[PDB]
Amino acid sequence: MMPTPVILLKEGTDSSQGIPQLVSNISACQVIAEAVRTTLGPRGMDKLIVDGRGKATISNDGATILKLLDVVHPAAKTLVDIAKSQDAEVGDGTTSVTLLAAEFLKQVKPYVEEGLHPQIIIRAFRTATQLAVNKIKEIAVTVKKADKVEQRKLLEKCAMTALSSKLISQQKAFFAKMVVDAVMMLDDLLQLKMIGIKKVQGGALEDSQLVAGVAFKKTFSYAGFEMQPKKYHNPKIALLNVELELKAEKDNAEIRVHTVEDYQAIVDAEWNILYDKLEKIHHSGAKVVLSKLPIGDVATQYFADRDMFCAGRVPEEDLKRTMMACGGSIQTSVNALSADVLGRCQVFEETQIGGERYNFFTGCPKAKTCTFILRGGAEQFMEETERSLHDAIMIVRRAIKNDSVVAGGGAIEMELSKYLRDYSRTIPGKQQLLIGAYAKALEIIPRQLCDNAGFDATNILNKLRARHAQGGTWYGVDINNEDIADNFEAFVWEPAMVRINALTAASEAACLIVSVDETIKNPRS
Amino acid sequence: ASMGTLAFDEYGRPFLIIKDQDRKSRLMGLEALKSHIMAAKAVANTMRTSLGPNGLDKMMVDKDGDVTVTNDGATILSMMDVDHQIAKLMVELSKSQDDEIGDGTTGVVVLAGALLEEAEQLLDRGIHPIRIADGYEQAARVAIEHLDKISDSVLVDIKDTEPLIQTAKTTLGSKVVNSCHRQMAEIAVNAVLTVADMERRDVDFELIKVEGKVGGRLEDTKLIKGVIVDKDFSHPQMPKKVEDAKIAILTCPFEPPKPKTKHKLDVTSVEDYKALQKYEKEKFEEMIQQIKETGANLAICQWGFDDEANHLLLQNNLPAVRWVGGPEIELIAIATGGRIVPRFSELTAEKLGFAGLVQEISFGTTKDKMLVIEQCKNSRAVTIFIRGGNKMIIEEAKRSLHDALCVIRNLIRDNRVVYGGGAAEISCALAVSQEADKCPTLEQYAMRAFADALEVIPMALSENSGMNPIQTMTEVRARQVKEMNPALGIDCLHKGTNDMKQQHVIETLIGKKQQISLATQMVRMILKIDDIRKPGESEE
Amino acid sequence: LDHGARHPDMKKRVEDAYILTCNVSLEYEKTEVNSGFFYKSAEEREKLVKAERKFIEDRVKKIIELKRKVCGDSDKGFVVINQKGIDPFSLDALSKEGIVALRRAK
Amino acid sequence: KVADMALHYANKYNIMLVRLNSKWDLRRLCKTVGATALPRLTPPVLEEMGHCDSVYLSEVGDTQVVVFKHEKEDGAISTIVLRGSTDNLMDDIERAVD
Amino acid sequence: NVDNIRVCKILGSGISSSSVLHGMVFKKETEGDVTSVKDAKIAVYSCPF
Ligand SMILES: Nc1ncnc2c1ncn2[C@@H]1O[C@H](COP(=O)(O)OP(=O)(O)O)[C@@H](O)[C@H]1O
Ligand SMILES: Nc1ncnc2c1ncn2[C@@H]1O[C@H](COP(=O)(O)OP(=O)(O)O)[C@@H](O)[C@H]1O
Ligand SMILES: [Mg+2]
Numbered sequence A: 001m002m003p004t005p006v007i008l009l010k011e012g013t014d015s016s017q018g019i020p021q022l023v024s025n026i027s028a029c030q031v032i033a034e035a036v037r038t039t040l041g042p043r044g045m046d047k048l049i050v051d052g053r054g055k056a057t058i059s060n061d062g063a064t065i066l067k068l069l070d071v072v073h074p075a076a077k078t079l080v081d082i083a084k085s086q087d088a089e090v091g092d093g094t095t096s097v098t099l100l101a102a103e104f105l106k107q108v109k110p111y112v113e114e115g116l117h118p119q120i121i122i123r124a125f126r127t128a129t130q131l132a133v134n135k136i137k138e139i140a141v142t143v144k145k146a147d148k149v150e151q152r153k154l155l156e157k158c159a160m161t162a163l164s165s166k167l168i169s170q171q172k173a174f175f176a177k178m179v180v181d182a183v184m185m186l187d188d189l190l191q192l193k194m195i196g197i198k199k200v201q202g203g204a205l206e207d208s209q210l211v212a213g214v215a216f217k218k219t220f221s222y223a224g225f226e227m228q229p230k231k232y233h234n235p236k237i238a239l240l241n242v243e244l245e246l247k248a249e250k251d252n253a254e255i256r257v258h259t260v261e262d263y264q265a266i267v268d269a270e271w272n273i274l275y276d277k278l279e280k281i282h283h284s285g286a287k288v289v290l291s292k293l294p295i296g297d298v299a300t301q302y303f304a305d306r307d308m309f310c311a312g313r314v315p316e317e318d319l320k321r322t323m324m325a326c327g328g329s330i331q332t333s334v335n336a337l338s339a340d341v342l343g344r345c346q347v348f349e350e351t352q353i354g355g356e357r358y359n360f361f362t363g364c365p366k367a368k369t370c371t372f373i374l375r376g377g378a379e380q381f382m383e384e385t386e387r388s389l390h391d392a393i394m395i396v397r398r399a400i401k402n403d404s405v406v407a408g409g410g411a412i413e414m415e416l417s418k419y420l421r422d423y424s425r426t427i428p429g430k431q432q433l434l435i436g437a438y439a440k441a442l443e444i445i446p447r448q449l450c451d452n453a454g455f456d457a458t459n460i461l462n463k464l465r466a467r468h469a470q471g472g473t474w475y476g477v478d479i480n481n482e483d484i485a486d487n488f489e490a491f492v493w494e495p496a497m498v499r500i501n502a503l504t505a506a507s508e509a510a511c512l513i514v515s516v517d518e519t520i521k522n523p524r525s
Numbered sequence B: 001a002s003m004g005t006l007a008f009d010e011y012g013r014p015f016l017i018i019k020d021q022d023r024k025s026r027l028m029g030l031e032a033l034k035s036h037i038m039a040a041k042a043v044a045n046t047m048r049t050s051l052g053p054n055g056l057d058k059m060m061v062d063k064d065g066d067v068t069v070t071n072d073g074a075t076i077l078s079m080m081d082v083d084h085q086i087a088k089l090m091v092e093l094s095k096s097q098d099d100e101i102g103d104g105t106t107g108v109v110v111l112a113g114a115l116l117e118e119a120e121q122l123l124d125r126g127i128h129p130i131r132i133a134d135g136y137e138q139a140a141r142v143a144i145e146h147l148d149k150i151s152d153s154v155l156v157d158i159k160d161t162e163p164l165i166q167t168a169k170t171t172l173g174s175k176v177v178n179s180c181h182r183q184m185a186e187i188a189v190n191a192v193l194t195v196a197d198m199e200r201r202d203v204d205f206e207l208i209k210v211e212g213k214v215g216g217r218l219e220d221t222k223l224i225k226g227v228i229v230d231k232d233f234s235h236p237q238m239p240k241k242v243e244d245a246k247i248a249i250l251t252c253p254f255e256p257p258k259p260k261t262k263h264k265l266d267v268t269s270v271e272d273y274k275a276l277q278k279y280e281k282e283k284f285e286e287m288i289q290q291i292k293e294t295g296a297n298l299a300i301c302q303w304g305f306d307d308e309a310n311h312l313l314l315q316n317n318l319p320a321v322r323w324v325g326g327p328e329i330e331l332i333a334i335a336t337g338g339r340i341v342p343r344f345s346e347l348t349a350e351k352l353g354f355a356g357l358v359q360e361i362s363f364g365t366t367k368d369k370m371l372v373i374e375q376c377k378n379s380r381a382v383t384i385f386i387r388g389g390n391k392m393i394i395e396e397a398k399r400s401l402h403d404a405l406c407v408i409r410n411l412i413r414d415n416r417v418v419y420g421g422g423a424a425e426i427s428c429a430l431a432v433s434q435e436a437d438k439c440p441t442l443e444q445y446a447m448r449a450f451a452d453a454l455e456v457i458p459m460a461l462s463e464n465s466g467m468n469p470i471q472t473m474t475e476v477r478a479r480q481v482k483e484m485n486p487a488l489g490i491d492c493l494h495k496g497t498n499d500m501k502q503q504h505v506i507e508t509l510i511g512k513k514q515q516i517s518l519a520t521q522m523v524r525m526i527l528k529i530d531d532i533r534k535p536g537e538s539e540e
Numbered sequence C: 001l002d003h004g005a006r007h008p009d010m011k012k013r014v015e016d017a018y019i020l021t022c023n024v025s026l027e028y029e030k031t032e033v034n035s036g037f038f039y040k041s042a043e044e045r046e047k048l049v050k051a052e053r054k055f056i057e058d059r060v061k062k063i064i065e066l067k068r069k070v071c072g073d074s075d076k077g078f079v080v081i082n083q084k085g086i087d088p089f090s091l092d093a094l095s096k097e098g099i100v101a102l103r104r105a106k
Numbered sequence D: 001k002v003a004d005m006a007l008h009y010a011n012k013y014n015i016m017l018v019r020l021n022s023k024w025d026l027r028r029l030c031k032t033v034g035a036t037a038l039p040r041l042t043p044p045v046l047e048e049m050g051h052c053d054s055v056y057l058s059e060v061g062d063t064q065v066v067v068f069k070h071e072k073e074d075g076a077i078s079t080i081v082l083r084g085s086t087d088n089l090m091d092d093i094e095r096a097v098d
Numbered sequence E: 001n002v003d004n005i006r007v008c009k010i011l012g013s014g015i016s017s018s019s020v021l022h023g024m025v026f027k028k029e030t031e032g033d034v035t036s037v038k039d040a041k042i043a044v045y046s047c048p049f
């Protein structure tokens, strides 16, 4: 390198080019995949990451772990991005994507080292991915009976499979039934904001409950609140967006009087405005009053005198859930409080839940929303329970969209690898090596399951390969029985779209990583 | 064994993946589990000395030097300045036990430590930690079922409260208030029973006011079926005692009205000034007259008042109290049976609260005056007034009485009880051991480890009382097996008998169930963590 | 000119054009002596809002009347180059009459 | 912005509300729909009223989107919805589209 | 006009799932309760509502 009097780029620019650059990219991808390797399958383990603030997070979810690691390697960030994509589109399988992509790169690393043109590898990946996705769509098992009990069983099995990798796997049947009921209660869009999740410290996991209605925490009651009754057997709920307080009429409103009786009239007029609002609310027939805006102490005492319930500063999401469950409308004005705009629930009650007070709206028959109340011994315990429930909810929603399932435990990927190897045996031979490498890389998931559970991976892989070659589609890893078993009759079911998206994203990430030849880093500003 | 990986590429080019990867750290595999188990063992061994009647307290100092001598496990763990994440998990477990139950905050930590020690031994023998967690969960289910089997029911009726007194006494035995043991237990039981929705519903804790004032003696602590107020009468010449007071609760300051909206009253002539002055005077006179018209004897205000109103109240034989806080206003209204009136125009006779006696109390040579409102007809709110020789025993008595109130609340929620002193733990260990015999071999080790971890509580109790742990626990277990009696425990107080039913050592069943459940779940979560990624920065 | 019409509905090309070079501010302006508005009802507020733009609308209407008097057909057109700003209301009013206007000229 | 009372009375009359924050998007919507951006709350006259075959709220992936959709294969403005697994990949596809 | 073609990037499903829409797509949410119209009559206001 001859030092030119005037340099081309800025001083401090770092450039890496050639085969070593791509080899380093592959190595970094395997480094990232190692950080989430052991969080796979029922015998997976959780990871603990402490940020700069010292607040640790404990998670089994691959996407969460990858997000918490502050990856700065440009090629390694592709794995994090595809994990995020898998989480967004599917919600489950955020670990399999990273393992599959890294395994593809590892399998093609020896061919890169010997100067193979990366376009050939990219073409082979595209062909193999298309064939695998077509095979998944072809062999996926679906039932064209539209039986309600069969659909319930399918969803429960899918939720159990999605849940059988987390700390709540011991209560997986309980939580799966809860999640299936919650997803059924949603009407048509399966909006996540219609499934509230409340975490209350203290209590066993089995103490968690699903309320067919809405529940939210008590919100800074004023004086005179304890004088209000706390149980109603057929209340009508007035959902409001109104500030029931004594206040200025407007921010820019100014009152100019020049006589004492005018002063008294103005004071009485403010009081009469507040009492007019309260009287309209009372004569609307409602017994429970909820407001997004604050409700003052005067209104609280007024409602206490009428044996009514008030709760101000209710969060907007909780008001939306209450409106969906009870069937009213959030009124910003109280001038027309008719019967059609008032919510109605069978029972309203405030109860003690683990050192906190919660308002319960139960008995809603037309409820299109639900609330989870999760109990646990720690903040991170309940957070990870929420993450597991989110995985299950996304799985059940996608299965509602289409009831196509493939047996889990690596059975589907062993079948795909067998099919891809059979295809690759019948091509000229330059693409044969790469497609065979793709098929071999497809074996990572069962191998990782066997490694995490403490098996001998090689023997189980040989048995799986022989079983698939000799006939048998849904034979996967049996963790408890130390052997292999038909994972379809074992009800290890996952939606086909999970594996479809996993393969697509992993292939795209591998192709993008391989397609790069030079990395240039400008000096930081 | 830190920072993760370091290769700098096979070709010598820089290999940077994680930001600040040269300053971070990570622990993997069985080594991280061993470190976590060591941390939990340290925390549990520190906590285990404060278990039982013979348990000792911990003197805790905060950042600013404030000293809190306490025996409450949750409080101790909350005031510890720990840095290990597993220690924080143990603190969270104790706080969760405090929230759900309020009693047994020290048993959960000891049980979790014992469970993790047995898990360490099993891991050294070469078992997957998930298998250990599954065995622990199965044994916990068996133990919970056995606890349900061997429980007993008690009456939660007001006419006969002896079982409630015994349960509160058992709760308070380990605290410093055991000198006034029966008095404290009785006042706690009465407080809980007074403020409670009888039909098995919740016990509302903002209806119990707990205040402590220095001086006097712990025996002077009493239950007031009313409200104690830190305020006093506004005028120095007002009478210090009112009999058969008809309270008038008001939330309007005894001042001329003021509109909330931005307002300007224009004075344009001398006649306007005269009218304004007369209006102010008439406002004061008419508010006093409206208060007096209802026949009230005592007027309680929240926002205070000014000199003219004060002297008019004194002149009209109306004792008054000002600047009473909102919660105290609500408590007074609830106890006296009156309603809260927002302005004098709405004040009527039917909204007046009735108090048999309102008095001002002096506290020695301190200038401090506090107001007693009691002798209400059907007071639905109660207050506990605690005295002591120093503020520290006052705080300890506060938390001990809170424990007793929580225990009686648990009894109200569920009246099934089991007998303490380690009898329940010994019976659960026996049931787990019997179950493990019929169970297949692989998880038999985990179930036996769970039983051994359960046996720590009788061992800790016997060691704290000076007896030999292993000898006493083995003798009690053999006696329990020989004759069917799950009530035999550790004679901590040396009363001559091992039968805790005769000794009246009573525990809430849901408390023990919550202890076992929370310990099992926390131990499972700790066992499932096999990787730590700390920043390792050690910032200033 | 290095600026164009600021309203999307303005014609992009006028064949025969009358050029009106003006230095008159067609945007809203504030009273020099701290005017301030006082009203006691929403209807009064709406009336005051509608009546506060009469000064600008008068000059806009003068321009409109001149255009309608000069070119009664659609063959010709007006281009108004103003050295001062033109608020969106005046731009809309002029565009409704098929007049292209430019503001903030040098 | 949308006032609370305005949102109330719009909900009462079953009127869909969309709040386009950027004026470029407002202009593009006016072009693709055929409406005129009214500077006041006056009711739109017949010519100024915009028309579209279907407007609805939908979720693509995990993003909430509002879709102004024409059934006819024609219009002033057409949009391309690019899916992908990485942001960089979609940026590259967008450059190719450009 | 080049600017009449709009590109909306939504993550998740691979580029093979891309499609063209005769209209516009905004990554936003509705303010009110109505979320679907079949015979839209859009009225556009440049002023606050
Ligand atoms: N009961 C089971 N037996 C065997 N394998 C299972 C079982 N449940 C799940 N698996 C497998 O574990 C793999 C990982 O699933 P999981 O860890 O829950 O989420 P992710 O796919 O994000 O890692 C899946 O591919 C699935 O096939
Ligand atoms: N009089 C007693 N005799 C024997 N054991 C007792 C007695 N009182 C309490 N214990 C035991 O001491 C243990 C610890 O109780 P304590 O220290 O009061 O609260 P915590 O359960 O939070 O440690 C309980 O499990 C109980 O069985
Ligand atoms: Mg999963």
Ligand SMILES: [Mg+2]
Residues within 6 Å of the ligand: B103, B104, B171, B174
């Ligand atoms: Mg205790």
